[PDB]
């Protein structure tokens, strides 16, 4: 199940990814390519350091941070994040997988996380 190279995309015009979960091996370099395949939406992907409580706080810092990237000033709670992609844009991010555990991924464009645009990165031991 575990993989070091992940391809993920938005689903149509909905506030959802085409993957709700993926697994990565701990301690190794991971490549994640996100494609905003929508025709009219803004999307990113943010992998946070922990679960739903961390994700909620990053989402709130994001909407306060505002346009155009909607990300917090620093990455203390972020494993990796793309920039805010327009329709048809894509980005590839790179990070050492952290300690084994479950890590929420989410889009921080306003209302999209609450709208269900989220998933879980499981990090295998
Ligand atoms: Cl692999
Ligand atoms: Cl972003
Ligand atoms: Cu989004």
UniProtKB/TrEMBL annotation:
Residues annotated as binding Cu(+)? 43, 107, 112
* Membrane-spanning intervals of the chain: none
Identify this protein by name. Blue (Type 1) copper domain protein
What keywords were assigned to this record? Answer: Copper, Electron transport, Metal-binding, Signal, Transport
Tell me a Gene Ontology molecular-function term this record carries: electron transfer activity
Domain Blue (type 1) copper intervals? 7-123
Positions binding Cu(2+) in this chain are 43, 107, 112, 117
Q: Which domain of life is it from?
A: Bacteria
Q: Span of the full-length protein shown?
A: 35 to 159 of 159
């Amino acid at each position: 199940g575990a993989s070091t190279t992940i391809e993920i995309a938005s689903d149509g015009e909905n506030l959802a990814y085409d993957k709700k979960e993926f697994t990565v091996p701990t301690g190794q370099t991971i490549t994640v390519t996100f494609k905003n395949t929508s025709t009219a939406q803004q999307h990113n992907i943010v992998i946070v350091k922990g679960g739903e409580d961390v994700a909620a706080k990053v989402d709130e810092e994001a909407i306060n941070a505002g346009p155009p990237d909607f990300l917090p000033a620093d990455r203390t709670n972020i494993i990796a994040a793309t920039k805010m992609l327009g329709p048809g844009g894509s980005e590839t991010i790179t990070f050492t997988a952290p300690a084994p555990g479950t890590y929420v991924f989410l889009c921080t464009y306003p209302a999209h996380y609450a709208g269900g645009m989220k998933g879980v990165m499981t990090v295998a031991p």
